[PDB]
């Protein structure tokens, strides 16, 4: 109730400020959906802790451990081994160092099918490509061979940092990236 | 028709609440139009606000029975049983149980076709912090304005009771809010969309300086309650009524406040570029209609909001869209 | 015991205080000062707490689109339309439906599959994660996102998550792989 009154106050002062609010209960989300000036199409957004928590847990009922995979994927962490760490913990901790990112695919991806773009990103760039924002626009997760990458497509990635994902934007014409020692990918594509 | 013992109000013999109780199916099946909706926020244990005082002026024997606005209270059913003892003698009254925040209740009661929605909290008016105290009244107001009926939103008329006058700033958009303006200067109060107890406390000093003038207000505001009626209620028997004599029925011919439009009819000639002084003299001479102020659109061109203008100057220019408040005898 | 299996049954526990994770299992080698995400019960997916979610404030700010990616998955496909229909207060309306809206059944889901048997078992038999990823994507459109591996190799049933392994990462025949899938 306090956080809903805060959004009401913020949007009474100026309707068009993007408000991101944390809610503890799902039924209270109806109240701010009914605010006259709330609009998800501007990116007004209610992060409901109960909705998310139980949906991450429901996902482990379908795919055991997926709550941990997906929760680690949404906070910024960097790997950093220690000599006291057992080898299973080094594998786990190396996985925790990865989180979700968004980038524009380079012109070299245009008119590939999504599976070809995902093979390319993985096998060359060391980047895991999950999904693409298809042009209004819609988010497509692992879409089949029936979809092409457009020009200027946003792609969703799993990687160790944003500066690692930028390889998918800088990715050269094939003429300028045959060697595949991936640190060498850089903006000099032409 | 039947009236109370002083002949001032329309009346029913006592009846149990489940004669007036309705489900959403029954409420939406009923042809509710031009009605009053009371959006009541109450816990079953919360203090009595006395809805008798809201309903009784809407049942003044001044009206014909066919022009009484039907009234629906939306609210907590266990609370409403407690008040029912006082309400049960009024005609054209029904109850829809459950929260006024639920959109299916508001659509079932035809909220978009009502003549007024009254948003009132019976909850303690003291809970937690001064921001939280008006949460339901603000959310109910905003929720009603956010609906559409295309199967009109902010076109529906609201009056909100506020527990803290400072919360008036949350009631509407493009008000240009300030924390330090007094309630009476704020746009929601100037439009008659908001009310609070803080505007009434000068009635101490007016009751002292002219007792007669407090009876003037009350005759109007109660729809004609009297010391006799107050004594009959203080006798603890409930509101006694029945069929009545021609001698007491003479009290039906009494003045009431009404609101009329300059858009059409005989007075439209003044809305077409006349002045308030011309309108006042003409209406008083031809109809005995005594004009006391204007209700004018705030903007002229796109919003539905209007504002009050108590007793304009004689050379004040009129608009064809103006409405005038009038004291009237029929 | 069910001899008429005990710790073989899979649990997920919601924790009100993340510090209590240390009581959930034995031979964890507990410390009070490790963050929840490092603890063995969380690494295995046996525990969860609200404290892992509060970075969704900063991700919602830095990429709104990526929060919709999580939710499409985590809600099983709730939408602004469904959220509005519920906010209309009538309850979840439903019935029989048109072929046009039934097209939404063909959508991606997260699934978990085993390298012990079937066509992918060739990779569990001493292959590498990079070989598995390319093969499954080419032959099935299956997009691999990580591993669920037994913690000990020999006697316990516990397994741990490995998000997006390297391409030269060695596989085991007992591994399970998390996959994005379309049927
Ligand atoms: Ca990282
Ligand atoms: Ca305002
Ligand atoms: Ca332990």
Give me the DSSP letters along B282-301. Answer: HHHHHH--EEEEEEEESS--
Name C162's Cβ contacts closer than 8 Å, sequence gap at least 6: A91, A92, A94, A95, C146, C147, C148, C149, C169
How much distance in Å is there from the Cα of A17 to the middle of ligand 2?
A: 15
Asked whether the beta carbons of A149 and A111 are under 8 A apart, the reply is yes
**Sheet strands side by side (includes A99-104):** A99-104, A154-159, A128-134, A138-141
Strands B158-162 and A138-141: unpaired
Tally of residues, chain C: 183
| Closest listed residue to residue B35, CA positions, set B104, B92, B103, B95 | B92
Resolution of this PDB entry, in A?
2.6
Residue A94 parent element (H or E): helix A87-96
Residues of B with Cβ-Cβ distance to C89 under 8 angstroms:
101-105
* C4: exposed, middle or buried (Cβ count in 10 Å: 0-12, 13-18, 19+): exposed
The pair of structure tokens assigned to C56 is 């969704």
DSSP H helices in chain B? 24-29, 52-55, 77-87, 103-108, 135-146, 187-190, 203-209, 211-221, 227-234, 246-249, 268-271, 276-287
Phi first, then psi: what are they for A157, rounded to 5°?
-130, 155
Å between C78 CA and nearest CA of chain B = 21
Check CB contact under 8 Å for A35 and B142.
yes
A71 in reach of chain C (CB within 8 A): yes
Q: Give the ligand at the shortest distance from the Cα of A72.
A: 1
Residues of B with Cβ-Cβ distance to C87 under 8 angstroms:
103
How much distance in Å is there from the Cα of B202 to the middle of ligand 2?
A: 26
- What is chain B's Cα-based Rg? 21
Start-to-end C-alpha separation, chain A: 56
Asked whether the beta carbons of C110 and A66 are under 8 A apart, the reply is yes
Q: Which residue has the tokens 């899979």?
A: C10
C-contacting chains (≥3 CB pairs under 8 Å): A, B
The pair of structure tokens assigned to A25 is 């209960």
Question: Which experimental method was this entry solved with?
Answer: cryo-EM
Q: Give the ligand at the shortest distance from the Cα of C40.
A: 3
Å between A175 CA and nearest CA of chain C = 23
The pair of structure tokens assigned to A95 is 């996985």
| Closest listed residue to residue C7, CA positions, set C25, C30, C21, C23 | C25
Check CB contact under 8 Å for A5 and B143.
no
Cα A118 to Cα A116: distance, rounded to the nearest angstrom? 5
Q: Is A163 annotated as a binding-site member?
A: no
Quick one: how far is CA B206 from the chain centroid?
23
| Closest listed residue to residue C142, CA positions, set C172, C105, C112 | C112
Exposure letters A51-88 (e unless 16+ CB within 10 A, then b): bbbbbbbebbeebbbbbbbbbbbbbebeeeeeeeeeeb
Which residues place a Cβ less than 5 A from the ion ligand 1?
A 78, 97, 160
Q: Is C47 left (phi over 0), alpha (psi -120 to 50) or beta?
A: beta
- Taking 3-state DSSP, the helix, strand and coil percentages for chain C, each rounded to the nearest 5, stand at 35, 20, 45
Cα A1 to Cα B136: distance, rounded to the nearest angstrom? 10
Closest by Cβ to A2, choosing from B132, B169, B175: B132
Q: Is the dihedral of CA A105, A107, A112, A117 positive or negative?
A: negative
| Closest listed residue to residue B58, CA positions, set B222, B214, B218 | B222
A-contacting chains (≥3 CB pairs under 8 Å): B, C
How much distance in Å is there from the Cα of A9 to the middle of ligand 2?
A: 8
- What is chain A's Cα-based Rg? 20
Cα A123 to Cα C128: distance, rounded to the nearest angstrom? 13
B173 in reach of chain A (CB within 8 A): yes
Asked whether the beta carbons of A131 and A141 are under 8 A apart, the reply is yes
Strands B158-162 and B116-121: parallel
How much distance in Å is there from the Cα of A139 to the middle of ligand 2?
A: 36
* C2: exposed, middle or buried (Cβ count in 10 Å: 0-12, 13-18, 19+): exposed
Cα C46 to Cα C5: distance, rounded to the nearest angstrom? 17
Residues of C with Cβ-Cβ distance to B105 under 8 angstroms:
89
Asked whether the beta carbons of A64 and C158 are under 8 A apart, the reply is no
Report the interhelical angle of C64-74 vs A49-62 (nearest 10°): 50
Cα B325 to Cα C99: distance, rounded to the nearest angstrom? 59
- What is chain C's Cα-based Rg? 20
* A111: exposed, middle or buried (Cβ count in 10 Å: 0-12, 13-18, 19+): exposed
Check CB contact under 8 Å for C87 and B103.
yes
How much distance in Å is there from the Cα of A48 to the middle of ligand 1?
A: 24
Closest by Cβ to A30, choosing from C53, C80, C87: C87
Name A59's Cβ contacts closer than 8 Å, sequence gap at least 6: A66, A67, A70, C73, C74, C110
Q: Classify residue C170 by its DSSP letter.
A: B
């Amino acid at each position: 109730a306090a956080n809903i009154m805060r959004v009401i106050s913020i949007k009474n002062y100026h309707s068009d400020i993007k408000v991101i609010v944390q809610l503890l209960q799902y039924h209270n989300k109806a109240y701010l959906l009914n605010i006259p000036s709330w609009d998800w199409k501007r990116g007004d957004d209610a992060v409901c802790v109960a909705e998310l928590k139980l949906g991450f847990i429901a996902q482990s009922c379908l795919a055991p451990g997926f709550s941990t995979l997906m929760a680690n994927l949404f906070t910024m962490r960097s790997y950093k081994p220690t000599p006291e760490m057992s080898q299973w913990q080094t594998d786990y901790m190396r996985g925790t160092g990865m989180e979700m990112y968004t980038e524009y695919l380079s012109s070299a991806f245009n008119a590939l099918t999504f599976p070809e773009a995902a093979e390319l990103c993985f096998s060359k760039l060391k980047l895991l490509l999950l999904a693409i924002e298809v042009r209004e626009s819609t988010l497509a997760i692992n879409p089949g061979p029936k979809v092409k990458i457009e020009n200027a497509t946003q792609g969703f990635f799993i990687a160790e940092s944003a500066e690692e994902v930028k390889r998918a934007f800088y990715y050269c014409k094939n003429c300028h990236a045959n060697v595949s020692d991936v640190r060498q990918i850089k903006k000099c594509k032409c | 028709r039947k009236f109370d013992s002083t002949g001032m109000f329309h009346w029913c013999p006592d009846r149990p609440l489940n004669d007036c109780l309705q489900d959403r199916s029954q409420a939406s099946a009923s042809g509710l139009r031009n009605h009053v909706v009371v959006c009541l926020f109450a816990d079953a244990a919360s203090p009595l606000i006395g809805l008798r005082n809201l309903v009784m002026p809407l049942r003044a024997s001044n009206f014909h029975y066919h022009e009484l606005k039907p009234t629906i209270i939306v609210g907590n059913l266990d609370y409403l049983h407690r008040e029912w003892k006082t309400l049960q003698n009024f005609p054209k009254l029904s109850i829809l149980p459950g929260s006024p925040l639920n959109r299916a209740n508001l659509r079932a009661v035809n909220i978009n076709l009502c003549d007024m929605c009254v948003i009132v909290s019976a909850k303690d008016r003291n809970m937690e912090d001064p921001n939280l105290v008006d949460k339901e009244a603000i959310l109910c107001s905003l929720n009603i304005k956010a609906m559409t009926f295309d199967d009109a939103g902010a076109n529906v008329p609201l009056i909100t009771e506020l527990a803290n006058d400072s919360n008036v700033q949350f009631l509407d958009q493009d008000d240009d809010d300030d924390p330090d303006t007094e309630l009476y200067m704020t746009q929601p109060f100037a439009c008659g969309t908001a009310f609070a107890v803080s505007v009434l406390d000068s009635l101490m000093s007016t009751s002292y300086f002219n007792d007669n003038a407090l009876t003037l207000i009350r005759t109007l505001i109660t729809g004609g309650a009297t010391p006799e009626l107050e004594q009959i209620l203080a006798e603890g028997a409930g509101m006694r009524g029945g069929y009545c004599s021609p001698a007491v029925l003479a009290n039906r011919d009494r003045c009431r406040v009404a609101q009329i439009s300059l858009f059409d009819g005989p007075l439209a000639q003044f809305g077409q570029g006349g002045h308030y002084g011309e309108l006042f003299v003409y209406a008083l001479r031809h109809f005995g209609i005594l004009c006391i102020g204007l209700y004018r659109f705030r903007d002229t061109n796109p919003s539905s909001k209007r504002y009050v203008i108590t007793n304009p100057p004689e050379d004040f220019p009129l608009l064809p869209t103006d409405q005038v408040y009038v004291l009237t005898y029929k």
